[model samples]
Target: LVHVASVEKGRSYEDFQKVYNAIALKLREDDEYDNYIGYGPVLVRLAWHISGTWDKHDNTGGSYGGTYRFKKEFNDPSNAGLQNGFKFLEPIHKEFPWISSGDLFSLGGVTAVQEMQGPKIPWRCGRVDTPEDTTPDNGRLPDADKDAGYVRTFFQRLNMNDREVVALMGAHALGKTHLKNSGYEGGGANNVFTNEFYLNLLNEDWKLEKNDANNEQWDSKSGYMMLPTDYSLIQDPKYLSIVKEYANDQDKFFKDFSKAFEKLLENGITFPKDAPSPFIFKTLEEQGL
Candidate 1:
């Protein structure tokens, strides 16, 4: 699964920026989806889900192939709620059919984060699509009903350490889990991208309770919830320390998160030193938001 670098021919910063602008504008316009949270959160999740399949042991899964377009990956029960994100990208793909699915999918995430005022996630291009045969089997993604040890072990496949794992989980601040989608519910903000996930984990008075979905989740009267895996951050000493650090300093969380996320998206792909340096796109706000 070593991805021989295949940067799209003649594609440059402006070409990808056009794709980014389309995603950003649509995110702004599609305000009615998911209780007006827009598409930002799901787009980020889509990118994560696509890349989360990566296995460092063999470079098998990952955003490299864009094979989620195939039925096997698309029909994954873990991806139940992600079809919306996929469908939303349809028009963009139609407009720019030349862009590789892997590149387009990951770039959707970059646009969503910047549009949501999250940190600048430096991104690289050149994730060429492979055949459906390359698609990894389902269930490689982490399960929510797991302990800290399980959490740590799960992320090992992605090569994420304690701090990186903590930083990546901070993304929970942006979206809620549909009981039907992931058998979990409730989350911070549900729209804005911030360190609120870490803040709430440290600040909230969370109680364990079973929801209508019959799954145990940490519930707070403030209208937030944590999956068992999210709770593991505090339950484990190492993860808890990093959680406290992020809860106290949003900037540090943002910086670390940017690096971890970029790393996540780029996993399993080898880039020559001459590959283009990572691109840091200007946020819409930078152009006056």
Candidate 2:
């Protein structure tokens, strides 16, 4: 359970930046996916689902293991539709076979977020792969049909607090929940990442209604949608205050989200004192590629 950070032999920021560029270029080329929502959102969701399984109590089930490639984790009902993200990475992994699965999975997310115009997520490079038996069993991820109380209690197992949870959920801005994959659906999905999830929560007039899955979601007249878990932000005064903070100041939200997200992926990892500083990757636009 004590997973230490070990860099892939002789690799440095330049090496990982190559991997980042590969993923970013393919993201640009693969424009027709998911009706043009692109692979950005699912890649973000993929990284989150893989990391969200961590339990600070026991130090098991985290991105540290790269266990999602295994059957038990891959077949997780909660992980449905993420195979798209995995398949998308298959060729990149083949080309850079030296990269550990944990590193690749986490970096795929980092690449996607930056390419999609999100904040720069500082990423460390040393997650060793654990055996198949180390994979956490299904059902560790949070449920969509829940409220603030459930959301709060669920994240404690992963050692995240209120501000962290609120900051992380800002990712909901990128992807839509699929009815088949998560028993929830519908959102004005946007490829660009922003504080709009919070903006919509506070600004929109939402009606509580049942979807085809018989689950309650907040539906906006503009066809935007929020799962009950997302709606909880405004319903709970504590969460609402943070939501307003994020919604009002874009720079604050970006900075907070980057820190919280990096911590999320870095959970269950033990970096040695001499480990390299986290890598902050540049977007393709910045690189002039």
Candidate 3:
């Protein structure tokens, strides 16, 4: 029942950094993806969704297994449109076949966030690929049209707290939802990361409306949209307080998001006492690329 983290045979920080650099470079070269939002948001979502399957009670799911590589997990309806993210990584995998699927998927997220000017997410790279049967059943991810209570209760299974939930939702600032993919349409490609999700929650005069998909979502005249679950932040007093805090404090939001995102990717794996410390890779800008 215990999935202990094991360093890829003889690999260390430098080897993983090279892989990180490759992902970062491809991110820059492939600027025309997802209508120029690049692969950043999709990669981030891919990392989260792969990790999102975890159930703390049984430890059946989570990022430990790299199960998304299997057809069953990939075909999960909740994972629709993520194929693009997976395809984007195929070349990287070909180049660095030594890295485990879970490690690569999780690191792609860390690279996307940092390259897009988001906070540096410390990442550990020891997620070994498990057998296909290890992939958990679908429907483990949360729903979009759900209410505040549903949103709060859902994260509990993943061992997340209120602040953690709020911080993770801040990622909604990165990309738009497509009507075809998720039955939710939001017309904004926010490639750069920020506390804008929280700010929008507080400042926008949102109207609940049916989109082209006929699914309910909160929209504003600013050409931005929020999931019913996203709007829940302001709808609930407790979540609203944290939203206000993040909206006003950009540094705090970045810091909190970094921690929670890392935690999301790391759930379910037990890092041994002597496992390597989390790696922090430099952005392309930091390398003057």
Instruction: Tell me the tens digit of each residue's lDDT in model 3 across 127-196.
Output: 9999999999999999998899999999999999999999999999998898888999866668998888
- The TM-score of predicted model 3 comes to 0.99
Ranking by lDDT: 2, 3, 1
Q: Over 4 Å off in model 3, which ranges?
A: none
Q: 209-250, model 2: which lDDT tens digit per residue?
A: 898988888898899999899999888999999999999999
Best of the candidates, lDDT: 2
Candidate 1: stretches off by over 4 Å:
none
The positional error of residue 258 in candidate 1, measured at the CA in angstroms, is 0.2
Clashing pairs in 1: 285-289
Total residue pair clashes for candidate 3: 0
Tens-place lDDT per residue, model 1, 1-289, is 4796577899888888888888888888889999888889999999999999999999999998999899999999989889999999999999989899999999999889888889999989998989989998999888998899999999999999999999999999987888889888655456778998988999989999998888899989888899999999999999999999999999999999999999999998899889988888887667664
Cα-based lDDT for every prediction: 0.90, 0.94, 0.93
